[PDB]
Design a binder for this molecule. Structure first.
Ligand SMILES: O=C(O)CCC(=O)C(=O)O
Ligand SMILES: [Fe+3]
Length: 212
């Protein structure tokens, strides 16, 4: 049994998990976290299940997205679980800027961001090898699944070229795991297609100077 006492939990994000992320410099500079969230178990059930739009291109991809919008800001996040309002507040905090600066020596102060929920949930949902738009200065993908059968596909793939088989590293879409990187001319990555209808749940933070 656990002790009859308090336990420290400074924020929803464990910022030390960003500062001390696994850090690759080759094939490109990319940080990979474990245990990004201090209280991961409730996040899967609280993830939104309405308000998504299916999007696809046959660079190729098929998935669904629900953006955070100015409507959510103006109604105090009333259509979302409170944890997503807290995540928005922490991403927009000095603590997040300080953690990224320590991890990868990139200063995001004064930059803008978009934040969206990305859901792959149908057999075949995927994204093909791509680098991200050059307008994006930093991308941070965060995963929320409590369980994931690796045989179902859906891994984030770090690649050495624009080829699905030219894999250097893989990340499973499990809560606590996340990947953050600056898009560059060789930041090739993809998502291995789903082999069955299982929801694979993530949030992407896209940081930029020039709107796109
Ligand atoms: O969900 C992921 O693991 C990565 C998605 C991605 O690279 C994108 O949508 O640009
Ligand atoms: Fe991408």
């Amino acid at each position: 049994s656990s002790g009859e006492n308090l336990y420290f939990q400074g924020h929803m994000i464990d910022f030390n998990a960003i500062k001390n992320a696994e850090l690759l410099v080759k094939p490109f500079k990319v940080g990979i976290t474990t245990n990004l969230f201090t209280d991961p178990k409730p996040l899967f059930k609280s993830y939104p299940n309405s308000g998504f739009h299916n999007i696809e291109k046959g660079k190729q991809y098929r998935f669904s997205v629900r953006e955070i919008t100015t409507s959510d800001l103006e109604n105090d996040f009333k259509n979302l679980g409170k944890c997503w309002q807290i995540l928005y507040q922490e991403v927009s905090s000095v603590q997040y800027r300080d953690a990224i600066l320590k991890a990868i020596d990139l200063d995001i102060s004064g930059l803008k961001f978009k934040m969206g929920f990305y859901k792959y949930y149908r057999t075949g949902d995927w994204i093909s090898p791509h680098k991200d738009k050059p307008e994006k200065i930093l991308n941070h993908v965060m995963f929320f699944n409590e369980t994931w059968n690796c045989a179902n596909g859906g891994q984030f793939l770090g690649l050495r070229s624009q080829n699905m088989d030219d894999i250097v590293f893989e990340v499973e879409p499990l809560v606590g795991n996340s990947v953050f990187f600056e898009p560059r001319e060789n930041s090739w990555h993809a998502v291995r297609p789903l082999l069955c209808d299982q929801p694979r749940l993530s949030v992407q933070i896209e940081i930029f100077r020039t709107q796109f």
